[PDB]
């Protein structure tokens, strides 16, 4: 699962979930050897408004969300951006060090 943890300005600690990643096989020998994965990530972005951005993705509509605002609850559809992707031991190493 794609998770992060954080604290608000108000101080409350919180766990967020963005989506999921399904790891393929990973007999990674060379530092460039590839792991195939599938990322399934939530979004409210309509992909058709900028379809060139999403060449590699297959976007699903998976739900409806009642979103609270100032003084009006809004109804927006919930998309799921699915795609096959890949990474390597070296690329993962440098991702772990992004701090």
């Amino acid at each position: 699962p794609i998770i992060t943890k954080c604290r608000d300005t108000s101080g409350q600690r919180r766990t967020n979930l963005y989506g999921f990643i399904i790891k393929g096989r990973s007999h990674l020998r060379n530092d460039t050897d590839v792991v195939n994965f599938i990322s399934l990530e939530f979004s409210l972005t309509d992909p058709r408004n900028e379809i060139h951005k999403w060449e590699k993705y297959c976007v699903l509509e998976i739900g409806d969300m009642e979103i609270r605002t100032s003084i009006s609850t809004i109804m927006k559809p919930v998309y799921l951006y699915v795609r096959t992707n890949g990474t390597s031991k070296i690329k993962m190493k440098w991702g772990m060090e992004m701090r």
Partner: protein, 49 residues
């Protein structure tokens, strides 16, 4: 996803990397209802959708 990402979340006293990932993940899914039957709204042109 960068700017286009969307989060399901829970209030949770846990620290910056605490708890079992899939247990936390299910906790986040249970906050959201109104899942639909899934439908393709934008195809991956080169792939079996």
């Amino acid at each position: 996803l960068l700017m286009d990402a969307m989060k399901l979340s829970v209030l949770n006293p846990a620290h910056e990397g605490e708890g079992i990932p899939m247990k936390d993940a299910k906790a986040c899914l249970d906050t959201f209802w109104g899942w639909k039957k899934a439908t393709i709204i934008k195809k991956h042109e080169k792939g079996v959708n």
